[PDB]
Design an enzyme around this catalytic site. Structure first.
Site, mmCIF file in Angstrom:
data_model
loop_
_atom_site.group_PDB
_atom_site.id
_atom_site.type_symbol
_atom_site.label_atom_id
_atom_site.label_comp_id
_atom_site.label_asym_id
_atom_site.label_seq_id
_atom_site.Cartn_x
_atom_site.Cartn_y
_atom_site.Cartn_z
ATOM 1 N N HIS A 61 0.808 -1.224 0.000
ATOM 2 C CA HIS A 61 0.000 0.000 0.000
ATOM 3 C C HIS A 61 0.839 1.272 0.000
ATOM 4 C CE1 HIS A 61 -0.058 -1.930 4.008
ATOM 5 N NE2 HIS A 61 0.169 -0.721 4.488
ATOM 6 N N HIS A 91 6.745 6.980 5.608
ATOM 7 C CA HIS A 91 6.240 6.594 4.308
ATOM 8 C C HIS A 91 5.527 7.783 3.710
ATOM 9 C CE1 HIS A 91 2.960 6.117 7.165
ATOM 10 N NE2 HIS A 91 2.191 6.485 6.159
ATOM 11 N N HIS A 93 2.125 9.108 0.950
ATOM 12 C CA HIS A 93 0.932 8.873 0.134
ATOM 13 C C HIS A 93 1.035 9.816 -1.047
ATOM 14 C CE1 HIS A 93 -1.017 6.807 3.574
ATOM 15 N NE2 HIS A 93 -0.225 7.629 4.236
ATOM 16 N N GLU A 103 -3.248 13.417 1.919
ATOM 17 C CA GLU A 103 -4.372 12.931 2.701
ATOM 18 C C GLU A 103 -5.034 14.108 3.399
ATOM 19 O OE1 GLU A 103 -2.855 9.365 4.870
ATOM 20 O OE2 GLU A 103 -4.029 8.439 3.266
ATOM 21 N N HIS A 116 4.597 10.960 6.008
ATOM 22 C CA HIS A 116 4.239 10.655 7.386
ATOM 23 C C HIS A 116 5.407 10.040 8.113
ATOM 24 C CE1 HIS A 116 -0.282 10.435 6.222
ATOM 25 N NE2 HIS A 116 0.142 11.673 6.394
ATOM 26 N N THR A 195 -4.523 6.432 9.073
ATOM 27 C CA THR A 195 -5.284 6.691 7.852
ATOM 28 C C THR A 195 -5.436 5.450 6.977
ATOM 29 O OG1 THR A 195 -3.408 7.342 6.466
ATOM 30 C CG2 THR A 195 -4.444 9.070 7.826
ATOM 31 N N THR A 196 -4.805 4.341 7.361
ATOM 32 C CA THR A 196 -5.101 3.049 6.744
ATOM 33 C C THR A 196 -5.588 2.093 7.822
ATOM 34 O OG1 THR A 196 -2.901 2.017 6.999
ATOM 35 C CG2 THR A 196 -3.266 3.357 5.058
HETATM 36 N N1 LIG Z 1 -0.938 6.634 7.453
HETATM 37 S S1 LIG Z 1 -0.553 6.629 9.005
HETATM 38 O O1 LIG Z 1 -1.665 7.208 9.718
HETATM 39 O O2 LIG Z 1 0.651 7.361 9.236
HETATM 40 C C1 LIG Z 1 -0.370 5.090 9.440
HETATM 41 C C2 LIG Z 1 0.744 4.547 10.101
HETATM 42 C C3 LIG Z 1 0.757 3.174 10.410
HETATM 43 C C4 LIG Z 1 -0.352 2.385 10.054
HETATM 44 N N2 LIG Z 1 -0.555 1.051 10.238
HETATM 45 C C5 LIG Z 1 0.300 0.133 10.682
HETATM 46 O O3 LIG Z 1 1.394 0.410 11.141
HETATM 47 N N3 LIG Z 1 -0.145 -1.128 10.554
HETATM 48 S S2 LIG Z 1 0.672 -2.425 11.030
HETATM 49 O O4 LIG Z 1 2.083 -2.259 10.790
HETATM 50 O O5 LIG Z 1 0.191 -3.556 10.295
HETATM 51 C C6 LIG Z 1 0.360 -2.645 12.580
HETATM 52 C C7 LIG Z 1 1.335 -3.149 13.443
HETATM 53 C C8 LIG Z 1 1.037 -3.333 14.792
HETATM 54 C C9 LIG Z 1 -0.230 -3.019 15.274
HETATM 55 F F1 LIG Z 1 -0.518 -3.198 16.574
HETATM 56 C C10 LIG Z 1 -1.203 -2.518 14.414
HETATM 57 C C11 LIG Z 1 -0.910 -2.332 13.069
HETATM 58 C C12 LIG Z 1 -1.409 2.993 9.408
HETATM 59 N N4 LIG Z 1 -1.398 4.288 9.124
HETATM 60 ZN ZN LIG Z 2 0.434 7.559 6.227
#
Ligand SMILES: NS(=O)(=O)c1ccc(NC(=O)NS(=O)(=O)c2ccc(F)cc2)cn1
Ligand SMILES: [Zn+2]
Length: 257
Positions: A61, A91, A93, A103, A116, A195-196
């Site tokens: 993603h 990362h 977007h 975003e 981000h 945001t994901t």
């Molecule tokens: N776009 S954002 O808001 O900066 C952002 C940052 C990170 C994440 N998601 C994320 O890290 N997901 S993950 O790595 O699978 C993960 C890992 C551990 C968790 F407890 C929950 C999710 C989603 N969005």
């Molecule tokens: Zn992000």
């Protein structure tokens, strides 16, 4: 299942992740005239001198530049934050066209991309713990516009061909995230979410007012990445942004007059 396509995009996420329609979802539109200057907000402290980047990963993603977060090496403090937040990854977007990709929006303006820098609150011990807390994360958001090249971004751009497809990673040591920052640290801040998916409501958002400029060539190389895995049909990794969500019962605060 979730993604950014017609059949699995942001409008579908609520079926697997009901918090998608929650009370503090991100991103949001930043209405600059309605945001209120908060004189008690402290200056932001970005301490990245000891940062240890490790790896760059295409996760299907976006791509993440990951850091060693087993010690206080690259930390965000001050601003609206209480305590110390450790940099774990950054990362972006971005869009298929320069007129979209960010975003957050500013008076409904979309930027070409948004960076981000994701940090977690060290009182929770690790990232997994932190995302379950309302003050678990601090994400530093930085807008990208297309113009002059960002020299500090080029090392990222040039490794992307080695992580074209989902699941590919590459060594990415000694990268200095200070080279991605604008001159000013003036910011807006509000309580929000990832945001994901899983869209957890654990983020203090700190969005910088000053965008950085990247070149058309730099962003074009972002758009050559793939959502798909190797040997699957090519789908370009573009428009991996969630649109603005309802502000609901929230006030955006500004660090500046
Ligand atoms: N776009 S954002 O808001 O900066 C952002 C940052 C990170 C994440 N998601 C994320 O890290 N997901 S993950 O790595 O699978 C993960 C890992 C551990 C968790 F407890 C929950 C999710 C989603 N969005
Ligand atoms: Zn992000």
């Amino acid at each position: 299942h979730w993604g950014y396509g017609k059949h699995n995009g942001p409008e579908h996420w609520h079926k697997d992740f009901p918090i998608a329609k929650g009370e503090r979802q991100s991103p949001v539109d930043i209405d600059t005239h309605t945001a209120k200057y908060d004189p008690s907000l402290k200056p932001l402290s970005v301490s990245y001198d000891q940062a240890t980047s490790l790896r760059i990963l295409n996760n299907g993603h976006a791509f993440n530049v990951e850091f060693d977060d087993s010690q206080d090496k690259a930390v965000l403090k001050g601003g609206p934050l209480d305590g110390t937040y450790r940099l774990i990854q950054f990362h972006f977007h971005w869009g298929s066209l320069d007129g979209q990709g960010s975003e957050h929006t500013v008076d409904k303006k979309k930027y070409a991309a948004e960076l981000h820098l994701v940090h977690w609150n060290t009182k929770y011990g690790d990232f997994g713990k932190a995302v379950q807390q309302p003050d678990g994360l601090a994400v530093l958001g930085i807008f990208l516009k297309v113009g002059s090249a960002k020299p500090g971004l080029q090392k990222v751009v040039d490794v992307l061909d080695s992580i074209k497809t989902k699941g590919k990673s590459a060594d990415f040591t000694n990268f200095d995230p200070r080279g991605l920052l604008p001159e000013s640290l003036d910011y807006w801040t509000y309580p929000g979410s990832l945001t994901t998916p899983p869209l957890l409501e654990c983020v203090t958002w700190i969005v910088l007012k000053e965008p950085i400029s990247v070149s058309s060539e730099q962003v074009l190389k972002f758009r050559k990445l793939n959502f798909n895995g190797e040997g699957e049909p090519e789908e370009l990794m573009v428009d991996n942004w969630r649109p603005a969500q309802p502000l609901k019962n929230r006030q955006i605060k500004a660090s500046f007059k």
